Design a protein around this ligand. Structure first.
Ligand SMILES: C[C@H]1O[C@H](O[C@H]2[C@H](O)[C@@H](O)[C@@H](O[C@H]3[C@H](O)[C@@H](O)[C@@H](O)O[C@@H]3CO)O[C@@H]2CO)[C@H](O)[C@@H](O)[C@@H]1N[C@H]1C=C(CO)[C@@H](O[C@H]2O[C@H](CO)[C@@H](O[C@H]3O[C@H](CO)[C@@H](O)[C@H](O)[C@H]3O)[C@H](O)[C@H]2O)[C@H](O)[C@H]1O
Ligand SMILES: *[C@@H]1O[C@H](CO)[C@@H](O)[C@H](O)[C@H]1NC(C)=O
Length: 496
């Protein structure tokens, strides 16, 4: 469960949020594989409700109608083509598995689904699966509204409807089998693992029963006995009866405290300062590193739809965001997930964004293709943070230093810190309102290194800042609080 099943040497996955299958296939071949990315988290590949009011929101994909691989991202043929091509180039595919529920109980019956499948939420009828009233938790939930009302009651959190979403009776073998059937179809197609959506809303034991029904990975691409990588979306910020540790037996869990705390520290909110990150990791009350799936922001909380709130850093806060992602990718804690989003017209009214529902770039509901500009950035409103030099290079930094211990820490008692990863990498940050100019012990072998944040190493030369490491392993670093990116990173492979 716990192993990503990524090709050796690749240490991160990227969430290509709302991308079309054909675009992801191309991205695997033209960018992801060459750049060392380990895999891609795709949006739900199963048929969902087509919601027109609001107009095709991103969240309509979290309201299943059937398990037919037919969505705005493409059909099954296109999906299989994507998995095959990505696998052939060593980039894994992780499917966002929405198995906790079906669509909203209030959704109108009809064929307003991404594949034309008929469904009647009112009568609990989903013939395309098929599911009926006996397959839901309506009779098991004890709240007056039928929805989840109190998170202090671990039971209703699991048996009731999350914001109205029809709750599947996961204790039933029939339902467990229909879900496993769907997941095995994908595993045999070639996917390497799954993001279990709303895992907090499922009993650890029900999830385990489903996983036990899963096949080993497709033997045409994976070694015998390979089990699917599982990461469970459990929002545990403490203070609730449900703990993410209860899910350790099924696989990894998303550590949402990670992004929220890194956000307040980097924003320097209420006394926080980077010097405190000296013992970042379990030392901050996070889950064990070998069970953690970490990230700075996710599709959910980058738009206020998840835990983290205001402290969360997103592409909107470019400068601080790159620094946050940089720290995450350099630090040994957890398995890292990189976000890749699209721009939407944020409309803040009384502190909140009224356009947080806006779906991906589209033409009359048809998702726009991801166009690559000559500078390698994306068009059609796709942000493509994974293509930002500072981020992409830190993705490589992680691959390069994989295995190396956290060493040579330094901090000025405020917001200027630095540390290395064995003798394969070193990173320095300046988040103070004054310049940083100091000679530090890097632990790297003497030589000239290209700073991978400001530039790239391009055949015996750096296009950006260069750092000179002496025989001592010492090197001078100068970072002005006015720098575009107030941090420097060098590693064994950016060595001239
Ligand atoms: C959104 C999160 O809500 C909880 O997350 C809980 C959290 O577990 C709890 O601890 C507390 O958090 C608290 C913190 O504990 C507290 O410390 C402080 O920080 O405040 C937080 C709340 O902001 O509340 C939140 C929100 O209910 C779950 O635990 C977590 O699993 C979930 N995330 C996943 C699940 C779903 C659902 O299928 C998706 O929803 C997404 O699709 C849904 C279905 O289309 C959308 O509903 C949409 O359709 C429904 C129809 O039934 C409508 O009733 C609803 O008004 C509409 O917005 C939803 O807006 C969207 O976010 C997400 O994209 C996906 O990533
Ligand atoms: C490095 O760049 C300089 C020009 O800035 C050039 O003289 C030199 O040939 C380049 N070295 C290599 C190995 O391309």
């Amino acid at each position: 469960q716990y192993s990503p099943n990524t090709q050796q040497g690749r240490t991160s996955i990227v969430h290509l949020f709302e991308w079309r299958w054909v675009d992801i296939a191309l991205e695997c071949e033209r960018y992801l594989a060459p750049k060392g990315f380990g895999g891609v988290q795709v949006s739900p590949p199963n048929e969902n409700v087509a919601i027109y009011n609001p107009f095709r929101p991103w969240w309509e994909r979290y309201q299943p109608v059937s398990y037919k691989l037919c969505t705005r991202s493409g059909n099954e043929d296109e999906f299989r083509n994507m998995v095959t091509r990505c696998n052939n180039v060593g980039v894994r595919i992780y499917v966002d598995a929405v198995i906790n529920h079906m669509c909203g109980n209030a959704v109108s019956a009809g064929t307003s689904s991404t594949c034309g499948s008929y469904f009647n939420p009112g009568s609990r009828d989903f013939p395309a699966v098929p599911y009926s009233g006996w397959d839901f938790n309506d009779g098991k939930c004890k709240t007056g509204s039928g929805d989840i009302e109190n998170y202090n009651d671990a039971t209703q959190v699991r048996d009731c409807r999350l914001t109205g979403l029809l709750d599947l009776a996961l204790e039933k073998d029939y339902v467990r089998s229909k879900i496993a059937e769907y997941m095995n179809h994908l595993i045999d197609i070639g996917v390497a693992g799954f993001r279990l959506d709303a895992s907090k809303h499922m009993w650890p034991g029900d999830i385990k029963a489903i996983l036990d029904k899963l096949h080993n990975l497709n033997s045409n691409w994976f070694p015998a006995g390979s089990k699917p990588f599982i990461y469970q979306e459990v929002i545990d910020l403490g203070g609730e009866p449900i703990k993410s540790s209860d899910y350790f037996g099924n696989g990894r869990v998303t550590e949402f405290k990670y992004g929220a705390k890194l956000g307040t520290v980097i924003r320097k909110w209420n006394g926080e300062k980077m010097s405190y990150l000296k013992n970042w990791g379990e030392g901050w009350g996070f889950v064990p590193s070998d069970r953690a799936l970490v990230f700075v922001d996710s599709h959910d909380n980058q738009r206020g739809h998840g835990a983290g709130g205001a402290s969360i850093l997103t592409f909107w806060d470019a400068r601080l965001y790159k620094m946050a992602v940089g720290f995450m990718l350099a630090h040994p804690y957890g398995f890292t997930r990189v976000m890749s989003s699209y721009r939407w017209p944020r409309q803040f009214q009384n502190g909140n964004d009224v356009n947080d529902w806006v779906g991906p770039p589209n033409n009359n509901g048809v998702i726009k293709e991801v166009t690559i500009n000559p500078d390698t950035t994306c068009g059609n409103d796709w942000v493509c943070e994974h293509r930002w030099r500072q981020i992409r290079n830190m993705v490589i930094f992680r691959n390069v230093v994989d295995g190396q211990p956290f060493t040579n820490w330094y901090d000025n008692g405020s917001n200027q810190v630095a540390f290395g990863r064995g003798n394969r990498g070193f990173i320095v940050f300046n988040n103070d309102d004054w310049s940083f100019s100091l000679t530090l012990q890097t632990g790297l072998p003497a030589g000239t290194y290209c700073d991978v944040i400001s530039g790239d190493k391009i055949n015996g030369n750096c296009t950006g800042i260069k750092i000179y490491v002496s025989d001592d392993g010492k090197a001078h670093f100068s970072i002005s609080n006015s720098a575009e990116d107030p941090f420097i990173a060098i590693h064994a492979e950016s060595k001239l």
